[PDB]
Amino acid sequence: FAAAXGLXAPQXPAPF
Numbered sequence: 234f235a236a237a238x239g240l241x242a243p244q245x246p247a248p249f
């Protein structure tokens with residue numbers, strides 16, 4: 234899960 238969180242996180246802006 235740690236890896237999952239870390240790799241996803243920088244893409245949270247993609248619709249904003």
